[PDB]
Every structure is written in structure tokens, then in C-alpha cells.
């Protein structure tokens, strides 16, 4: 039991492929509980200006009713056997997964096969779901973090489908005829862009049998996204009545490919995260976190590595009062250039340990394992074993971190998104000038 032995003791995720193109994957270890989910390659990145929000509407109507199971009866079958049904639709992925018992796996697939292929799309359900979506859009408007992230996506991927929000504009939600939903399901829920992931106590042979028996009727054997562009800009929503000032600044990072993710994820791990309710505070290793805790300069800050296929957003999002935005910008940018110019070996080792803990802690529990299987099959084209992750972490050193940070951070036009009392946010010229160090 020396980590490496444990890493090679993790059961592998066998992958099979039906004729239709559905990629079936399973990982049985011990558990009597399982998480089985269909991952679609659909999302807001694929919808055009008129179809924006169609994926959200389809996800909303997926569980309400099907063809074989009329309406609420579906929920009954989920509740009667104790299964928990859930769905999430990010910008480039969609997923419907149920957590059930190992015994209920033959049924677990069937309900899923009902949801993805033959939904109901009942007109009255659409009519009520329209109001539901409008109110949910209001709730998300109240969500200041989500609003800031959507603003960042809008101002970074300007003029591209990536800038489109997942929920879509409120004007679109009104029209959204049933024909549009049917067309979107037809040309975005095809078999090749499906991964049937199943974690927990599922046998891959049994999964293959059920998938073949329940998914063969799907389309067997074209807009396939386009490389988006980065437009370094900023959107400032000066709303002084808001209590805090949410700010997010990001740069063009790597994609799902481009192994530079591994070093950069280390560098972000060096910056770390911290909010008001934390532990050591001033004693934290991160210089930014220590300074913020010492001077009470923040109520929160986080480092994000949002990475899509062709590109992605790599940066930091912080929540602070109106009188600390400028100092925060200075300290965050200074930490970025400190990593770019002189990373040091000890900091890189700390980041490597933190990132090692991240993957293993995340890959705990049936649902996160199934989600990782689906996301890895869709994005990377394979489920990357934890041993390969360990090797990639090991290959990262101070020089590699310095080089990759200089490639992605040093002298780059950033995309900024502020919201709240953000009048003290430094002007974009000042922010960009902070992205190059005269001393170096």
C-alpha cells in the first residue's frame, strides 16, 4: 500500500462500442449501488441564435413524460425503487443519470432508454415549462456568481456560439415551438454522440446486453462545432446597490487535449482558494490567500480552469467589497507573474500534491466516477487511468510550470467580467499592463 500499488489497484473502465455508435462503459468495484447515465455531446455550444436554450428546455421536459410511460408514471418507477434521477446540461455536454441499486440495473437502463430516445414533448407541458424557465432565469439572475461567469463567457467568446448561455435568452424561451425541440432532439441526440457510463456494481457484459437490447433502435452508423475565438474584453455591470463585487478574469487556456492542462492545473493549485470561513487564514501557503486573510481583502476567491474542446477559460474569480478590487487585481496579477517568472521547486511540489489529492478525492463515490467516465469518453476519447494522471503530475517540475505559465499568462489580453460595486475595478489598460512585468 504505497500509493502506486493502490493506483494500479483501481479497477479499469472497460469500453465497448455498439453498431449505432453508443459508447458503453462500466467500472465494477464492489458496491451494491450504481450510477448509470447517458452523456450526450449536445449543449449550448451547438445551438444557433434561435435554438439557444433548446437544450435546457429538452432537459426540463425529459423527466416530465415519455411515450411508453405517460407523464408522472415515469417518476413513480424512479421513486418506487428508490432511484434518484438527475440531469445536468453544461455548455458542451448533457447528461441524464440515475443512481439505483445493483439489482435494479436492468430496469435502470430501460427508464434511461425511454428518456433519451422517445420523449413526450407534450404541448401543455411545454407551455407550463416555459413559465418555469422564465422564473428559473430570474433565479439565475439573482445568482451573482453564475451571472458573472455568463458575462465572462459572453465577453470572451464574443461573436461565437460559445458565448451563448445555457438557458438561452428570455426572448427565445417564449417562442421555442415544439418543432424546434423535436428538430434539436433529432440532430443532437444521435447515437454516435452518446456515452452510456455506469459506475458502481455493474458488470460490463450485463451493461452491453442491456444497452444492445434497449438502444439498438436508435439511429445507426453536418454541424460539428467550429473553432471559437478569444476576444479579450470586459463587461462591467455597475450595480452599486449590490452588497459584494463579483469579478472574474480569465485568459485563453488549453482544451481537453493539449496536456498543458496538467501543469496549469498545478499552477492554479498554487494560487488555491479561500473565503471568509476558512482555517489557518494568514498561515496558508498561497501568498494571495495569506495576504487576503491578513488584510481581510476578500470574502472569496477561486481559480477556475474551464476548458472546452477547441479552447477554454483559465483564470480566477474573486468576491470582495467595493474598496478592495484594485488591491485584489494587483495581488492576483502579481501572483500570476511570480509563477511565470520564478515558480520555485517547493511551490511546484505543493501544487503537485494538491492536484494529486484533487483527482483521487473527486473520483470517490459512484456518481462522480460515472460522471468522470462519461466526460472522459466524450472529451478525451478515453477514460484516462489514475496511473497516467500520476505520471503526468510527476513529469511536471518548476521549469515546465514556468514555461507553460509564460505561454498562457505572460503578456496576454484578458477577458474580465465584473458585477456589483465594481467602479474601483482597474481600467482595462491597467489590467492589461499588469499582465507584463517591466522588471522581467
Partner 1 sequence: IPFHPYYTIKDILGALFMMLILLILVLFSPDLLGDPDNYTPANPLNTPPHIKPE
Ligand X SMILES: CCCCCCCCCCCCCCCCCC(=O)OC[C@H](COP(=O)([O-])OCC(O)COP(=O)([O-])OC[C@@H](COC(=O)CCCCCCCCCCCCCCCCC)OC(=O)CCCCCCCCCCCCCCCCC)OC(=O)CCCCCCCCCCCCCCCCC
Ligand Y SMILES: CCCCCCCCCCCCCCCCCC(=O)OC[C@H](COP(=O)(O)OCCN)OC(=O)CCCCCCCCCCCCCCCCC
Residues with a catalytic annotation lie at 59
- Stretch of residues binding ligand Y (CB under 6 A), selected from 19-27, 95-103, 173-181, 430-438: 430-438
Torsion, Cα of 268, 273, 279, 281 (10° steps):
80
- Stretch of residues binding ligand X (CB under 6 A), selected from 30-38, 266-274, 307-315, 432-440: 432-440
Distance, CA of 440 to CA of 438 (rounded, Å): 5
Binding to ligand X (CB under 6 A) within 159-178 occurs at none
Is 439 a binding residue for ligand X by CB under 6 A? The answer is yes
298 backbone φψ class: left, alpha, beta (φ>0; ψ -120 to 50): beta
How many alpha carbons lie under 13 Å from residue 46 in its C-beta half-sphere? 23
201 backbone φψ class: left, alpha, beta (φ>0; ψ -120 to 50): beta
Query: Shortest approach of ligand X to residue 402 CB, angstroms?
Result: 17
**Nine-digit cell string for 84:** 434518484
- Report helix angle 261-271 to 398-408, nearest 10: 90
Residue indicated by cell numbers 489598460: 429
Distance, CA of 252 to CA of 259 (rounded, Å): 15
Is 433 a binding residue for ligand Y by CB under 6 A? The answer is yes
Q: Which does 426 bind (CB under 5 to 8 A by kind): ligand Y, ligand X, partner 1, none?
A: partner 1
Is 3 a binding residue for ligand X by CB under 6 A? The answer is no
Question: Toward ligand X, which CB reaches closer, 335 or 367?
Answer: 335
Query: Shortest approach of ligand Y to residue 234 CB, angstroms?
Result: 17
Cβ-closest position to ligand X: 438
Is 429 a binding residue for partner 1 by CB under 8 A? The answer is yes
With CB under 8 A, what is the number of residues at the site for partner 1? 5
Q: Which of 278, 274, 319, 348 has its CA nearest to residue 422?
A: 319
Is 430 a binding residue for partner 1 by CB under 8 A? The answer is yes
Instruction: Output phi, psi for 427, to 5 deg.
Output: -60, 155
Q: Which does 439 bind (CB under 5 to 8 A by kind): partner 1, ligand Y, ligand X, none?
A: ligand X
Among 3, 278, 330, 380, binds ligand X (CB under 6 A): 330
CA 114 to chain centre: 26
Is 438 a binding residue for ligand Y by CB under 6 A? The answer is yes
- Residue 242 contacts residue 419 (beta carbons within 8 Å): yes
Pairing label, strands 23-26, 14-17: antiparallel
Is 201 a binding residue for ligand Y by CB under 6 A? The answer is no
Query: Shortest approach of ligand Y to residue 278 CB, angstroms?
Result: 29
Instruction: Output phi, psi for 92, to 5 deg.
Output: -120, 0
Query: Shortest approach of ligand X to residue 426 CB, angstroms?
Result: 9
Q: Which of 351, 334, 331 has its CA nearest to residue 289?
A: 331
With CB under 6 A, what is the number of residues at the site for ligand Y? 3
Cβ-closest position to ligand Y: 433
- Stretch of residues binding ligand Y (CB under 6 A), selected from 76-84, 110-118, 174-182, 431-439: 431-439
Query: Shortest approach of partner 1 to residue 430 CB, angstroms?
Result: 5
Is 255 a binding residue for partner 1 by CB under 8 A? The answer is no
Is 437 a binding residue for ligand X by CB under 6 A? The answer is yes
Distance, CA of 260 to CA of 278 (rounded, Å): 30
Among 88, 426, 436, 437, binds partner 1 (CB under 8 A): 426
Query: Shortest approach of ligand X to residue 233 CB, angstroms?
Result: 21
Question: Toward partner 1, which CB reaches closer, 29 or 433?
Answer: 433
Is 414 a binding residue for ligand Y by CB under 6 A? The answer is no
- Residues followed by a break in the chain (C to N exceeding 2.5 Å) are 221
Give the distance between the most distant pair of CA atoms in the chain.
69
Is 254 a binding residue for ligand Y by CB under 6 A? The answer is no
As to burial, measured by CB atoms within 10 angstroms (0-12 exposed, 13-18 middle, 19+ buried), residue 189 is buried
Query: Shortest approach of partner 1 to residue 301 CB, angstroms?
Result: 23
CA 91 to chain centre: 8
Residues contributing to the site for ligand Y (CB under 6 A) = 433-434, 438
Query: Which residues of this chain interact with partner 1, rule CB under 8 A?
Result: 426-427, 429-430, 433
Q: Which residues bind ligand X (CB under 6 A)?
A: 330, 433-434, 437-439
Amino acid at each position: 500500500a504505497t500509493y502506486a500499488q493502490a493506483l494500479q489497484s483501481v479497477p479499469e473502465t472497460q469500453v465497448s462500442q455498439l453498431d449505432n455508435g453508443l459508447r458503453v462503459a462500466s467500472e465494477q468495484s464492489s458496491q451494491p449501488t450504481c450510477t448509470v447515465g447517458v452523456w450526450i455531446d449536445a449543449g449550448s455550444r451547438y445551438e444557433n441564435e434561435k435554438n439557444n436554450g433548446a437544450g435546457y428546455f429538452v432537459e426540463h421536459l425529459a423527466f416530465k413524460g415519455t411515450k411508453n410511460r405517460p407523464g408522472s408514471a415515469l417518476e413513480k418507477e424512479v421513486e418506487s425503487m428508490g432511484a434518484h434521477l438527475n440531469a445536468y446540461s453544461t455548455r458542451e455536454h448533457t447528461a441524464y443519470y440515475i443512481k439505483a441499486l445493483s439489482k435494479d440495473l436492468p430496469k435502470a437502463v430501460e427508464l434511461l432508454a425511454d428518456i433519451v430516445q422517445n420523449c413526450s414533448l407534450e404541448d401543455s407541458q411545454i407551455e407550463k415549462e416555459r413559465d418555469v424557465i422564465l422564473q428559473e432565469l430570474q433565479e439565475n439572475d439573482s445568482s451573482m456568481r453564475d451571472v458573472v461567469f455568463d458575462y465572462l463567457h459572453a465577453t470572451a467568446f464574443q461573436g461565437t456560439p460559445l458565448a451563448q448561455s445555457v438557458e438561452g435568452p428570455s426572448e427565445n424561451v417564449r417562442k421555442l415551438s415544439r418543432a424546434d425541440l423535436t428538430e434539436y432532439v433529432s440532430q443532437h441526440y444521435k447515437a454516435p454522440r452518446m456515452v452510456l457510463a455506469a459506475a458502481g456494481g455493474v458488470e460490463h457484459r450485463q451493461l452491453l446486453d442491456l444497452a444492445q437490447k434497449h438502444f439498438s433502435s436508435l439511429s445507426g452508423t453536418v454541424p460539428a462545432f467550429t473553432p471559437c475565438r478569444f476576444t479579450g474584453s470586459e463587461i462591467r455591470h455597475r450595480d452599486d446597490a449590490l452588497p459584494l463585487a463579483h469579478v472574474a478574469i480569465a485568459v485563453e487556456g488549453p482544451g481537453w487535449a493539449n496536456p498543458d492542462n496538467v501543469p496549469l492545473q498545478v499552477a492554479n493549485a498554487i494560487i488555491g482558494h479561500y473565503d471568509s470561513t476558512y482555517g489557518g487564514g494568514t498561515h496558508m501557503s498561497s501568498t494571495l490567500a495569506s495576504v487576503a486573510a491578513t488584510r481581510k481583502l476578500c470574502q472569496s476567491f477561486q481559480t477556475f480552469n474551464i476548458c472546452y474542446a477547441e479552447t477554454g477559460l483559465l483564470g480566477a474569480h474573486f468576491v470582495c467589497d467595493n474598496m478592495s478590487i484594485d488591491d485584489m487585481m494587483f495581488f492576483l496579477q502579481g501572483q500570476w507573474m511570480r509563477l511565470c517568472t520564478s515558480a520555485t521547486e517547493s511551490e511546484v511540489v505543493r501544487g503537485k500534491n494538491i492536484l494529486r489529492n484533487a483527482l483521487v478525492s473527486h473520483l470517490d463515490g459512484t456518481t462522480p466516477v460515472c460522471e468522470d467516465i462519461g466526460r472522459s469518453l466524450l472529451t478525451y476519447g478515453r477514460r484516462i487511468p489514475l496511473a497516467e494522471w500520476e505520471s503526468r503530475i510527476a513529469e511536471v517540475d518548476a521549469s515546465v510550470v514556468r514555461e507553460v505559465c509564460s505561454k498562457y499568462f505572460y503578456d496576454q489580453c484578458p477577458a474580465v467580467a465584473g458585477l456589483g460595486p465594481i467602479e474601483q475595478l482597474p481600467d482595462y489598460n491597467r489590467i492589461r499592463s499588469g499582465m507584463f512585468w517591466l522588471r522581467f
